[PDB]
Design a protein around this ligand. Sequence first.
Ligand SMILES: [Ca+2]
Ligand SMILES: [Ca+2]
Ligand SMILES: [Ca+2]
Ligand SMILES: [Ca+2]
Ligand SMILES: [Ca+2]
Ligand SMILES: [Ca+2]
Ligand SMILES: [Ca+2]
Ligand SMILES: [Ca+2]
Ligand SMILES: [Ca+2]
Ligand SMILES: [Ca+2]
Lengths: 335, 335, 335, 335, 335, 195
Amino acid sequence: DLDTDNDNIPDSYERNGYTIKDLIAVKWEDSFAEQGYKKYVSNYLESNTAGDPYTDYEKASGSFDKAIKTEARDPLVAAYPIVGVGMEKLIISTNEHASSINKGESAYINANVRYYNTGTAPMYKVTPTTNLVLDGDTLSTIKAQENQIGNNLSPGDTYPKKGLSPLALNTMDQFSSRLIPINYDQLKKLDAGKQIKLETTQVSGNFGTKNSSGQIVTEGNSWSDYISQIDSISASIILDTENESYERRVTAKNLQDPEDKTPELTIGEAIEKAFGATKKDGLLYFNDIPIDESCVELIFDDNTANKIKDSLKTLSDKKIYNVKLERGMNILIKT
Amino acid sequence: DLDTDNDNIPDSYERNGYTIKDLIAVKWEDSFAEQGYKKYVSNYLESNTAGDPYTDYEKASGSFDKAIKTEARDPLVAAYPIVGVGMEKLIISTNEHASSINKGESAYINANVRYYNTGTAPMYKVTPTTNLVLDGDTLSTIKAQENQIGNNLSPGDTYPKKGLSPLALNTMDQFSSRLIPINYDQLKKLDAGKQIKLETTQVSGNFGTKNSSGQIVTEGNSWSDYISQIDSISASIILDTENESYERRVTAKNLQDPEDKTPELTIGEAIEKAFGATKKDGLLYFNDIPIDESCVELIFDDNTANKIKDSLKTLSDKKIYNVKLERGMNILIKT
Amino acid sequence: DLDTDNDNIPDSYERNGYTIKDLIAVKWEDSFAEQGYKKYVSNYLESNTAGDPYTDYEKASGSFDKAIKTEARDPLVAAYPIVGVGMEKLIISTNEHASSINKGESAYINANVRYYNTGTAPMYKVTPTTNLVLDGDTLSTIKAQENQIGNNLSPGDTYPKKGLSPLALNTMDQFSSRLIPINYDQLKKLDAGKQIKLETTQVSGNFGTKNSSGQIVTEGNSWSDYISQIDSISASIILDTENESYERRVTAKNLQDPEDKTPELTIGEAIEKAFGATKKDGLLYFNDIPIDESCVELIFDDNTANKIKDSLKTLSDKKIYNVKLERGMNILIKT
Amino acid sequence: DLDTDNDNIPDSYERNGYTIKDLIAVKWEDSFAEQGYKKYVSNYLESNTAGDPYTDYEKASGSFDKAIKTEARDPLVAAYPIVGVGMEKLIISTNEHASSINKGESAYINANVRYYNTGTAPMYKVTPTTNLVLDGDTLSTIKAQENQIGNNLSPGDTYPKKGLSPLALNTMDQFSSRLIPINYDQLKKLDAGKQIKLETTQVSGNFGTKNSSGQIVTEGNSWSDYISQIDSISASIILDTENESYERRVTAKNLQDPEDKTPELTIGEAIEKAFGATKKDGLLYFNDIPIDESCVELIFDDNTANKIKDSLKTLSDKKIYNVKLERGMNILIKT
Amino acid sequence: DLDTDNDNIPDSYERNGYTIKDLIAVKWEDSFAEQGYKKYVSNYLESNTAGDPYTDYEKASGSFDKAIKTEARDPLVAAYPIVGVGMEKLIISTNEHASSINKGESAYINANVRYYNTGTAPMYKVTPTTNLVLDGDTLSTIKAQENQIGNNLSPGDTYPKKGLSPLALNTMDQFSSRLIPINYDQLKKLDAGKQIKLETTQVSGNFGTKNSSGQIVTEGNSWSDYISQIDSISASIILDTENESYERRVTAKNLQDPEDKTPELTIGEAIEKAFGATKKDGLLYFNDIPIDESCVELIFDDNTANKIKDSLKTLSDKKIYNVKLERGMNILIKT
Amino acid sequence: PIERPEDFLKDKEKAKEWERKEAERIEQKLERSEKEALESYKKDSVEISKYSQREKEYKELRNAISKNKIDKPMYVYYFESPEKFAFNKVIRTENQNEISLEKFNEFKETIQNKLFKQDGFKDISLYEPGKGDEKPTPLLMHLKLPRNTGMLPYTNTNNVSTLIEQGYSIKIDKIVRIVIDGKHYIKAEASVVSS
Ligand SMILES: [Ca+2]
Ligand SMILES: [Ca+2]
Ligand SMILES: [Ca+2]
Ligand SMILES: [Ca+2]
Ligand SMILES: [Ca+2]
Ligand SMILES: [Ca+2]
Ligand SMILES: [Ca+2]
Ligand SMILES: [Ca+2]
Ligand SMILES: [Ca+2]
Ligand SMILES: [Ca+2]
């Protein structure tokens, strides 16, 4: 009956819980739990609670790119593609002149790469900016060109899909006509037994917005416009299954900001909402493998570790999973 | 009378089945089966059901490009061009200097290739990104340039049509001015008897949108904006006849999501809708060859095999053509 | 009750102090002090008090790109990304022909660089112009190309983030195809032991505006349009903590202009507003470290020093933090 | 009460003198001098009196790019960036092949340059054309490319700011991929001791306008559209102080045109309005140094000298600062 | 009181003569000549009576690019920038290989040129297409590239202004990267004492409108869209003073069209209007030197001489300054 | 109308592009009479609108714009002063950013179960006009227009507006309390019940 930020969700519904039925917003009741509906809470002052381009209504009603995983339908989870690049092989092409060698243009490297999406989103024009390193020395920072642009990185899928060979990476120019050089010093250092490593400094791409009736527009809508905002107002949770990795970013409240009206979440609730787990017998299960604190290994960095120590020494239950999640903590879950 | 997804077809008609009479929709009856009209049921919550760009009204009325096969007019089938690249021959040119040889650019390749369409749609500007491999090491990944770009790839046809020679692929740069090099090691590996294979990682194409008058626009519209959505809400069915192949995708329902209002289909209904087969003597026939379970061989992968395994132990009829169609199965039918 | 600059902040509120509640402007009362709210005083004549692209209302309400720090929400503090480039390692590649040397292009340089941000704003497409100097001889001035471009430079973060390797600058041509040349004389100077320095002459970047409902566009929006404006109407404040640096710019009042109505700020008030410091026992503390004048080292240039001495001779408090902050003063604070 | 040129200033106000209070125009009174207001007289028949892109209302109210100096607020002074290029060093790279010399491309030149703005306006994309002359022959003319383009050039500032080494210039192609050639003749002339001079022919740039809610915009607004008009209807006055030089262009009335209604100015009044000097004790002082004709040296060209001699012999006061300023006069002041 | 082509000028005013006062047209009277006004007569059927892009009202009122000369304010005189290229020096670079010569690229030239404007308009992006000829054989035709493009060629000025060195033109490709070649035969002809001449075929450029809201736009407004129109409906008159040359195009009347309603002009009135001469004692004076027929040399081509003979034989005054000016005449005036 | 939804939700670029396209496709289909007629409204927009709320201009425009009927139903947004909504009181002024939950409910009680008439020459948009467009009143409208209603785009001076004649009845459904560009507006969705 009163909407401030124009997401077609009233403030009372957003604050007290709501659900989407036949593309309209209704109050949440406990009787809707058995049908498969979920309880949603968002920010009644911000159009996008999580920072991803899709608004609260689009995320809740699922009127977006259907390749987005269903765990991102919750408005508090950021639809945010985490794209890494795995290096599978390296090919050395030395240009010896036999009928002579040059110590500035002595080798050509063709690196076999393979993209990996682990986030809750498809990244429509994957353009990784990868730097090759050896001995801590950065060889080259090259952005993928039109040959190497891999469109359609589905969640949990590699751009050269299963059964296909890795992508080839051998050109540094914007138009793929100049091969990556290596001088004689590091050619001999590579011959001495060292290994080229590859790092992904950043990945550029696009997201498909909905336009007209069923139209999907991908041009001019880049992910880098929202990557910084998402990484600012979120916290990262990484599950490490024996066969897959799942990285999610969940929006968390700010105590020092009184106008920040994002809903409060615990770390356990955030894990449940991010990974789509099931609350059975009070325990959390995600795809027939236990995920609770006593069953897995939790890994944090320094600030998160000290944060949880302070919060535990101030808390009464003395358990990790029922403590407040705040903006900017890294959690790694290993099973 | 009431429409929710706004595709010019009411929700009651959408749930109870419908057919098109003079570019308008009416309630479906069994009497229209004798005149040749089929039964169409689609999703009353999505503007387009199968994931393809065309809306359900356009798919039912056939008001799009007429090169799409007439079985894809069913809204539950996805207008989706599945193409590949068949490599026919290889020409190698070793650029030795006779009066000298360079060990980094000792050879060039001329890959003779031909495009193969098998989906229920053409791409009006075919651009395959194909990699060339040799004994597990990827030679190069090349996206087709303006020379190798092929328009009008009609379904069931090749871009160099029958009677024409295969196209030549010889350039890596965006403008076709740089040949593909091969160093000495891969030259020796080729000359030792090993064969270079070709794979197609991605294909970039256009879909023609038809305006109110006669106007087909294929500029700025890409398939890559929708192939993720189709692979998400679709299931792949492959038919392997001796002379031709037929690859299709049929949307599948998710039982965990209460709002996924896509119609429920069985495997047999999905096959008959995706191939336009007719019900003769209870069985199914596709172009004068039996297709039923007792006459053909059905092959799946591990996940699909397990899915049908548990659903068959749950089911009583114990027939693979009477089992529920779930999201993301791979079916290969060999006759 | 009146608005002259139509920034959606009434004139009396803008002069006497105001705060933002529920994305709307209200008068400031003492009851909001304990709730976490802050007091905003802005200029009542023009739309942007600090000159940065976000208006007074957008700055005060925080309805902009959320990666902007909290202390930039005060209208008298300019949202301003101060971007630097730090050099980590330099690589020298001599192209001696062995079977010969060229005296004009005898060497190629791989420069490992890393981008730093220190202001209250993210630069969404980082393009630094870096000149490499050697004994006063500016060898080459290179703008960052597509390969070395940087998206998502969040405040306090590096474009190659912590744990990632530096980026490689090796191309001077606009398309990254031509390596950086070094002639025989400067190569001899480099081999004698002299070190190449790297300087940043300009940084070109983009800022994201919250277009429509949550949409962000960073194309056509350049920071160079407002670099000069902000550097004109401001005074630069730099803090050098042992682990991090913080550079901001604070709007200053002009006595020579009777129609300049920017609010008066002392140096202490300017520091508190620009840094979000907390007043404990009257003194100023910044994140549990002392920042008051008696506990830090102040460094000024000639203009700031002369103005400070003259205004302190005029004043009676004889404290640097209690004097009016003028336009165009450089203040460096070290702890 | 009546406005003819539609510039939001009444014609009677423009003719009798006016000042801007609360961003609106009011008639001038003598009591406003004690508050710091400056008397403004404009032309009521042309929208832009000085010819610069900002209108009379914007110039008088100061509602333009705030980096524009306060001296350009008077509508009779043209906001006009006088930008020059200064050589600091020249580096010559001899292209000898050592194991050979080419007589057409024997040497390459690295020109270290630094920009200098002196007018009352900032130029936002400083692209100068420098011609390198030697012994009367123009070796080359070079427009600055993307590497040498310098944005955000504030008045009185150098694009490589004070503290940074000068910018390098070594390529003539639009994409910086071809060094500047010198044949054996001018190489021998340089080795004989002749020195290369640099001149600036044209200097292209941009200026910032206000666009809707997007604020400052700088693309598509070139100075070259307006510098012809400004240089036509103005007189150029140059001040030479031992620290900085000040170039201004003050609009002048045409006596033979009876529609040219621009205010009539003397040379003394024009100098005072151009430099913002203060008239105390009859004489004019600019930043606390005298500027009157009995304390400075005035330099004219032939046309200005003849005009000034004839007008002095016609006039009775016999003072250079008391005589009418005509169109197209060059005055240089040395202190 | 009636306007046919709605050019803010009534038909009766346009036919019988008018002057402009306060930006509105009024009937011309004999008393207005004392105040400095002029008599304007134009064609009441064409919005541009001379074919130049500015309307008759804009030309009469002077509401155009203000650097246009005062003598082009008369509507019958065409605003037309006549741009020529003068060659000052030739730089010969022989690319002998010393340690060889190629007789196909044996020489490189770097022509020092300078632009001259003579018409009554500034031509805002001068792009001359000049051919270098040698004893009738055109070596190469070069259109000026981005280096050689000179904006702001003001009337009566040179693009390198008086005091600067000539511009260098040395490349013929669009992106300035390859020098101009001369073969063995032409190099030997140059060494034998022959000289290279420089002719201008076309000069492309822009002009300034004011169609935007208070702005001048010179992109897409080319003179080449109007030079043919003016050369069709115009007659060229050239005056050759010792220090300057002045070329004008004055529109003439066709007697074979009953609808060509442009005012009839004699050659005396045309000269007076085209050069702004003053009628002192009946004779014509331009810049205080007589141009009356008794004291000046008039040059015509063959067709003009035949026309002048056939028209003087049917006249009673036998004066060249009295005969009706026809279309497409070339009159040269030498004092 | 080759392809266009009922409502361009907060889409300025697509609305402007399509309105350009329809303006061109109507200009090169109409006759000289409305070419010389619509300039009268273009340069005296208040006069003819407040006259149609001497008959040659009105008749020509009505005939020329009751001939371009729209097929798809549409949703249009225009700012309407709440002085013709039987709300003879004031709600806010132009710059007072506060609306109250004491006159919000008064507006709710004033416009409820009542079909207000709305007829006249007027101007509308095709999108949600926030953050940059003119905001003359604190009441935004969300009219729903059925098939076969008058429509025409026209380019005033490089800027495109759109004219509709109406025999309408608004039939309000609810009232939202939007805050956009730091201001409290009421968005009022209504469904046309044609007479
Ligand atoms: Ca909300
Ligand atoms: Ca919300
Ligand atoms: Ca429907
Ligand atoms: Ca549907
Ligand atoms: Ca205000
Ligand atoms: Ca303000
Ligand atoms: Ca005026
Ligand atoms: Ca004016
Ligand atoms: Ca006329
Ligand atoms: Ca006319």
